[PDB]
Amino acid sequence: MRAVVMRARGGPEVLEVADLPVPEPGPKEVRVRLKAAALNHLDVWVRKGVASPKLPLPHVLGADGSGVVDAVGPGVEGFAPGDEVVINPGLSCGRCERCLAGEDNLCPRYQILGEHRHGTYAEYVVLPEANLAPKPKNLSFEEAAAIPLTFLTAWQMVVDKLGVRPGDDVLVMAAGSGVSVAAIQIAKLFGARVIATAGSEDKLRRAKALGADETVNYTHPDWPKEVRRLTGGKGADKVVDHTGALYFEGVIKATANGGRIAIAGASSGYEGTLPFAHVFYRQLSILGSTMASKSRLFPILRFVEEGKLKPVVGQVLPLEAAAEGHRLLEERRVFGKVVLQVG
Amino acid sequence: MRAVVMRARGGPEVLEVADLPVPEPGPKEVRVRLKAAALNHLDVWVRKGVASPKLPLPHVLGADGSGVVDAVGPGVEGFAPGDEVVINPGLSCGRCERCLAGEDNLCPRYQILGEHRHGTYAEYVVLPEANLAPKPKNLSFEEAAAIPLTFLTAWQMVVDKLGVRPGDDVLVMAAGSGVSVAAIQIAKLFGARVIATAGSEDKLRRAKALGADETVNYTHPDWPKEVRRLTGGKGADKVVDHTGALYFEGVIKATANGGRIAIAGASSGYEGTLPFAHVFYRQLSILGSTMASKSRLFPILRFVEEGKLKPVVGQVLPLEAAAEGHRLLEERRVFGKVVLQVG
Amino acid sequence: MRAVVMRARGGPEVLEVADLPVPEPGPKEVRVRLKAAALNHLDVWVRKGVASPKLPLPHVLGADGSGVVDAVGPGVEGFAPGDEVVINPGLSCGRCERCLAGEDNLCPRYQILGEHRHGTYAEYVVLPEANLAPKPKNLSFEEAAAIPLTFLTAWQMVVDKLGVRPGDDVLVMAAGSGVSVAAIQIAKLFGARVIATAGSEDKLRRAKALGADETVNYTHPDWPKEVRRLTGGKGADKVVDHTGALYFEGVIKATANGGRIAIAGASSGYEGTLPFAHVFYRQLSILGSTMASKSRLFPILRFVEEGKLKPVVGQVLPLEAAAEGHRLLEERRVFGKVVLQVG
Amino acid sequence: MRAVVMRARGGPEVLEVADLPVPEPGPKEVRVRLKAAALNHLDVWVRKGVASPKLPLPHVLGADGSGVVDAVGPGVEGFAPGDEVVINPGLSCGRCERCLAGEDNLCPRYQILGEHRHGTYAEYVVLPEANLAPKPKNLSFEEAAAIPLTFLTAWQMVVDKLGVRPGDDVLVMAAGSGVSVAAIQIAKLFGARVIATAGSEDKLRRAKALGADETVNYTHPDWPKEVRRLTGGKGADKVVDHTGALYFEGVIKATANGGRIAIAGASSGYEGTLPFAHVFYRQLSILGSTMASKSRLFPILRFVEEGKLKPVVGQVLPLEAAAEGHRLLEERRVFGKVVLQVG
Ligand SMILES: [Zn+2]
Ligand SMILES: [Zn+2]
Ligand SMILES: [Zn+2]
Numbered sequence A, B, C, D: 001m002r003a004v005v006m007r008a009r010g011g012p013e014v015l016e017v018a019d020l021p022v023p024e025p026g027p028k029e030v031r032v033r034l035k036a037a038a039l040n041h042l043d044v045w046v047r048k049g050v051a052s053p054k055l056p057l058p059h060v061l062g063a064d065g066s067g068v069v070d071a072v073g074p075g076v077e078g079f080a081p082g083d084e085v086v087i088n089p090g091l092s093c094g095r096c097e098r099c100l101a102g103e104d105n106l107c108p109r110y111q112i113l114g115e116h117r118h119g120t121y122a123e124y125v126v127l128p129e130a131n132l133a134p135k136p137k138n139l140s141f142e143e144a145a146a147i148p149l150t151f152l153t154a155w156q157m158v159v160d161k162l163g164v165r166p167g168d169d170v171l172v173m174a175a176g177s178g179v180s181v182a183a184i185q186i187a188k189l190f191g192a193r194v195i196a197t198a199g200s201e202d203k204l205r206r207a208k209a210l211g212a213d214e215t216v217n218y219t220h221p222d223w224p225k226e227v228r229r230l231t232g233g234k235g236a237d238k239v240v241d242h243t244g245a246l247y248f249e250g251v252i253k254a255t256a257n258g259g260r261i262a263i264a265g266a267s268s269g270y271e272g273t274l275p276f277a278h279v280f281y282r283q284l285s286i287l288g289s290t291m292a293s294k295s296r297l298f299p300i301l302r303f304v305e306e307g308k309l310k311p312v313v314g315q316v317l318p319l320e321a322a323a324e325g326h327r328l329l330e331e332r333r334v335f336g337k338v339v340l341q342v343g
């Protein structure tokens, strides 16, 4: 089958196109014929070698994917060939205390597709039936593929970690990244008043159309005051920061006392600094968050089918232009998700 | 193999010994050679026909069980023949929203072993690897088999439903019967002051031995008054009831303002009238609870190995005497679990 | 000053106009010149004698009220004469554990204005500065007076008790009566899909205008079946009931598995028998709720100024017609609040 | 009256002994004749000038205090002369949304005694009746005084922020500090298995006697591994760090994935660094915590009266040796609290 793979751990030039045997489905497993694969930051991390070292090469990247059920292994129930589905990137054992508690993302054997094993940058992929979910009919394959990873991550942050509720002033940093665009929508869904920050008026323009109530350009090293102004001088109650590596000094200045700040986990190895004194004294909470319970995908897709949440496909390129896709992310030039059309 | 089948629905006499073929473990399944099967009131409802209608016959009852791993399916890890284990009676599909969230006991396809599928009243039983936990080595097989079902039910009521915490006055109804044995111990484990009620002086004496700080006899028409007197006149904060529909009026009377009452399988007789406006005006909360999440069996067994929680085996009977065992249980005379010894 | 005193306990005719001396504000107290006093079912229980026995006479009823600051005690800040305000009907000692925890409505000395102390059925009333909130400027005095009592009760039931969240199917009983008006709006505010039930077509039509997504008529012996049909057959997840003791059997039937039912002042007639084992087997939860924490009045009024929540004034009557007002309320005919105009 | 005051903002030499007019009680206020005053870190901070700048000098330090009610102002209820009491250092307005919600420590007007106004380093002090609590009879004045501030702070951290429960492995850093000794006890009370760290075997010896299950000396730059070893290799689930400025790099290495770490707020202005990448990726939560709801003191004292919690008075000196007391803290030479006998 056709697939993009990485011969080495370098820049986007390491991603090449080759042929690999079509994987076969095992018991309780399912083979999917991919129609679309979404790019994720996790991809670039592994591609550089900052994540998942000593990984078997060549490697097939890709955590987000959508398509049609090609074949089911022995003992499979709930899926058949021809069925449209989207992948749920969370691979867990399903036996440990964490999994049985609905916390598979905390499983000691937790693995994201394309991180440890071959992902969605191919025409085919096999995975446990439990990791497959029906694709909504009102969406295109590309749109479907862009949902899972970022929506899951933004859901844990906004709902479970920040406990967002109506009345809350939510600050979403760097509107434009996959996590951001979903966090803005989910936060609105929970009655929040969203304030989104970005580095260009163009991204702010898009954040506004996405549902943001107020927007702030952090190009000006005084944006925290603006955020304070927009929130009656008290600052944001809850903050969604998909990185923490962007003017975090300001973020905390924009955050209300007792405020909560959620930071989307990443294997970027980024070493920075976190203000102790004037952070814990103001009783601020800084919560690391990564992916989310696989159970979150069902209600997320439902809201997407109802139209309350929408995927944000900024660009689509052919699977073979995977390299070009990575440069689009590394150069941060697209508002929303980057999707690869497969087949 | 030897097994106690259910020829037809009716009195305990319908339970007879028969020879059934040995079940074979599927892909992710394992066959356990049973040593002890604990008796639950659920087995009685199935026997009488009150539960699980349209149930094929013959049927093997039994939700609780302990034993040794006999054989394991092809693709199965974490279990080998010889391993001592106890059964996690909760069966679900592990693919729906409820299951992925850990709330398997709320799965639309949720099933308790022995309720619809052959249970533990045999020398062998086959279940998914997800429903098997290591048997604590400090316990006898009859003690181990007695844990699961009641400890899980008592745990959801005390920990999740009632949110028992140190300083709480917890009231447990009818000691020695149902989930009281486990509820008194879990309650204390969470820092509460337990007040237990029973009918005989023996059971109350038995209650204190389990950790009950105070005892009350509900054979008197004014026992609710003693509970009030025993808690500074305010009444109990949290209440664990598995009988109800008889003393419920007394419980409601014994419950302090804003108190919480957790009800297990209170399928008693008449429902009188239930003095409402008493539960509303005083902001009381009545919570129904059946079983618990499979994940809860891990902390339980851990506390059991430490000796902070322990099962109470009231009587042991040979497997071929399941009938006599159902009699003992139906008359609620024995203090503790009735356990069948298989092999 | 003019006031409607309660000469004796009995029918609404016991309410008569009398001249009482003007109360004087203590140290941290303030005297409010009332403009409107909203009528609550509580005023009726006090009038009949069913509530607050040993109550000195004459007594001035009235828990809800709005007006202008008249005079303030010596040591008081944050209030000046001329300021428009609404009353927070919750009176507590503010020194006990319950009060310091915010749960003032659970204070052992908790008292609702007008229940034991002179209320709002007069031209002036004196209460602690802690029980006064700024009146939203976008509302008329009768609209303002209608908010507090019902919005606080509906909020604790929806937000704290039921934990309503987006995607939830909330069922509100008897629209236009009690806390339904507020519950339908708060429910929607928290992202639920509201199904409202009423007796007349007018009230149901009125319900949808308030945000009710679906409507059902409980005049039919099978209305519970419509709620089930209206929620994918599963039933309502959360239920707000302020009547009970009459349709409660229907509610329980309309409640989905593991559902929660919040009950306000369901002090209806007979209690029939209440089909238990249905609330236990299906793990249902019945929660009693009276009033709410004073702190909750702040977010409520904020949403009211934004227009996300709005009071519904059913009828206005001059203060001297409190008697006629109690009739209108006792017959549960008027849709919305019955508000007395003082000055 | 005799009292210790600070003429300037320098070392412990600025604390002098002088005479100041005896403060008079106002409405709803109470004058206390101090018998003992406990030293707190907050004291040294303000004494140096790192906290509460532009504060009126001379200033009377002291947040913790116990003694006898000297006189009550007009309109006081609940207290009379001769009554033994301990101070609740949290001064809040009692009107803002935070206060009425039981979150007075989050009030915008929150002030700790001795931080903004004259504290307990005198023979007399006046404060709102709401800030006074009855001293348990089984305790000496010195012992009583050492409870409030640190126990309150350790309570919010352990119970509210870390949500400690039985089964949890709690890591308490720097056993010896006021917060630590209380955190160890409260954590045990909630069923935790406590691991305490310190720099000398002597403090570890005392932490063991206090209730710590396991102890680790962080003098050895490899202690995190030891903590991991003691917790089956998974690390601590919850961590109490009353500073964060002590081997925080190790703390996070000793913390289990998904773990929670509570840091006691301080106006030390300590600027350090917080590991981003490998912290949020492991889904760690870092929670700033300061003081606690005044409501927490009641249940805390109760547990002290029951004997479940005990104050830890490491040393007592005469009020006039306040300077010496501060050097004992600045030189960190005492396990537990330092108390000043007054009068
Ligand atoms: Zn797992
Ligand atoms: Zn399921
Ligand atoms: Zn109170």
Ligand SMILES: [Zn+2]
Pocket: D092, D093, D094, D095, D096, D097, D098, D099, D104, D107, D108, D109
């Ligand atoms: Zn305040």
